[PDB]
């Protein structure tokens, strides 16, 4: 989210995320007002369940085109640069970045495909730069009549209106597989108490009782303790061993 430069929309980056802990609340500090549309999952309950892999796609698009990044949408960026599947789950986060990706002379490093023979299957990249023959005469690589170069540049300028200023877009995609889930958010904690009847949780173990200093000696890998009657009687504190 804090990278200096994002890739062009047609050559959009692909980032894989696994075996990590993510705190999405910080994502609310990007802009005073920004889009946080989430599909198939409530944003406020992203810190409870977790998935096997996360896919992040980041790029920059014109502001008024931001509505084209959604399932079932149609247009030009939707079908020629980046297409989302109809059965898509995840989130899309787009915010204004006029203070970072605007040149007084005009930015030209951001490119988008304009002409394509057919539409784009969801999650597909097309980096081809071969000339597009609009008509029937094969120009064989010259930008004359009925032959247009498929890539055009957003001449971003700070003097433009809000409808044309650049906007940074990051798409998060989640999924479930038979592989065990690994990307789970933080779980918080609370200070310990001793010699008092309290309700306690230990690594997903509910309980109620009095915690006292223990004389039992677990093995290094041992976590729980069970008595004759097959009930929990000894526990190991996950933070301090």
């Amino acid at each position, epitope marked *: 989210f804090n990278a200096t430069r994002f890739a062009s929309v047609y050559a959009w980056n692909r980032k894989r995320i696994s075996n990590c802990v993510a705190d999405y609340s910080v994502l609310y500090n990007l802009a005073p007002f920004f889009t946080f549309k989430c599909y198939g999952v409530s944003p406020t309950k992203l810190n409870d369940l977790c998935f096997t892999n996360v896919y992040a796609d980041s790029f920059v698009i014109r502001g008024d085109e931001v509505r084209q990044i959604a399932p079932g949408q149609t247009g030009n960026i939707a079908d020629y640069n980046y297409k989302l599947p109809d059965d898509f789950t995840g989130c899309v986060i787009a915010w204004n970045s006029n203070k970072l990706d605007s040149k007084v002379s005009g930015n030209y490093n951001y*490119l988008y495909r304009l002409f394509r023979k057919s539409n784009l299957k969801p999650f597909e990249r097309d980096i081809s730069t071969e000339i597009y023959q609009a008509g029937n005469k094969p120009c064989n690589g010259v930008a004359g009549f009925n032959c247009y170069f498929p890539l055009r540049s957003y001449s971003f300028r700070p003097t433009y209106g809000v409808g044309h200023q650049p906007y940074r877009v990051v798409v998060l995609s989640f999924e479930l597989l038979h592989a065990p889930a690994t990307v789970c958010g933080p779980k918080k904690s609370t200070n310990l108490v001793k010699n008092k009847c309290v309700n306690f949780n230990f690594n997903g173990l509910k309980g109620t009782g009095v915690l006292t200093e223990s004389n039992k000696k677990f093995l290094p890998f041992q976590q729980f303790g069970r008595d004759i009657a097959d009930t929990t009687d000894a526990v190991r504190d996950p933070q301090t061993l």
Partner: antibody
Framework: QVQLVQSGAEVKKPGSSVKVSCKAS????????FIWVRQAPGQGLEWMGR????????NYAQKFQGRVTITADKSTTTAYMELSSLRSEDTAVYYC??????????????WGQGTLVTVSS | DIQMTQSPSTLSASVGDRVTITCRAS??????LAWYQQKPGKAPKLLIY???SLESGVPSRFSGSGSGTEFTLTISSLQPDDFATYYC?????????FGQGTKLEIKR
């Protein structure tokens, strides 16, 4: 990665025009842009012009209208500058520098060795 | 046009020393600025673009820091190959201006 080669040093009377070539070798050429920058012996740097041939945008310095024009050839994958109305103070060395789409066009990732152009009688 | 200058014009440094060069423009140029080193007699090589990014192959010791209208390039541990001419260039708006040229030298 990409080798930049310029022309040689040239001596010419001020009443003429000079054409200077710059060839870049390495990677795809269609994603590159060319700037021409000057180096005078008695002071520092001054930029003149930037060219994006694949997108076809030309931008020359405010003090260089009608005097220098820079074009690019796709078949030879080269760049050329022609400068007219040579003045006595215009004796100095030229650097052809190259910018990449991956990054920024204005910045110059690679540089040429330069051409020493001189005018006298 | 943006008129910009760097300080100091000439700085004397030694091997292993930490030094800094400042570069200030007339008005705000956002964060569009690049740094270049020139050994006397050859072409310059870019070091920092966007005033923060480190080029591939450029040693990480060189540090750039700046937001707009003031920028600094700092060297923590200097080596005898760091004595050269340092040049700024802003690329906000057309007519890209350059720097005067700061010479780094040893103490005689």
């Amino acid at each position: 990665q990409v080798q930049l080669v310029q022309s040689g040093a040239e001596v010419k009377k001020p009443g003429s025009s000079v054409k200077v070539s710059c060839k870049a070798s390495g990677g795809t050429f269609s994603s590159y842009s060319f700037i021409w920058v000057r180096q005078a012996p008695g002071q520092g740097l001054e930029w003149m012009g930037r060219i994006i041939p694949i997108l076809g945008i030309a931008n020359y310095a405010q003090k260089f209208q009608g005097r220098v024009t820079i074009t690019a050839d796709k078949s030879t994958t080269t760049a050329y500058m022609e400068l007219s109305s040579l003045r006595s103070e215009d004796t100095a060395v030229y650097y052809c520098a190259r910018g990449t789409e991956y990054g920024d066009y204005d910045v110059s990732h690679d540089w040429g060795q330069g051409t020493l152009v001189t005018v006298s009688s | 046009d943006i008129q910009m200058t760097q300080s100091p014009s000439t700085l004397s440094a030694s091997v292993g020393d930490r030094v800094t060069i400042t570069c200030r423009a007339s008005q705000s140029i956002s964060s569009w600025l690049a740094w270049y080193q020139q050994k006397p007699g050859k072409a310059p090589k870019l070091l920092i673009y966007k005033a923060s990014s480190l080029e591939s192959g450029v040693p990480s010791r060189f540090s750039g820091s700046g937001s707009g209208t003031e920028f600094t390039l700092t060297i923590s541990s200097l080596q005898p190959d760091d004595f050269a001419t340092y040049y700024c260039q802003q690329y906000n708006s057309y007519s890209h201006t350059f720097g005067q040229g700061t010479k780094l030298e040893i103490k005689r």
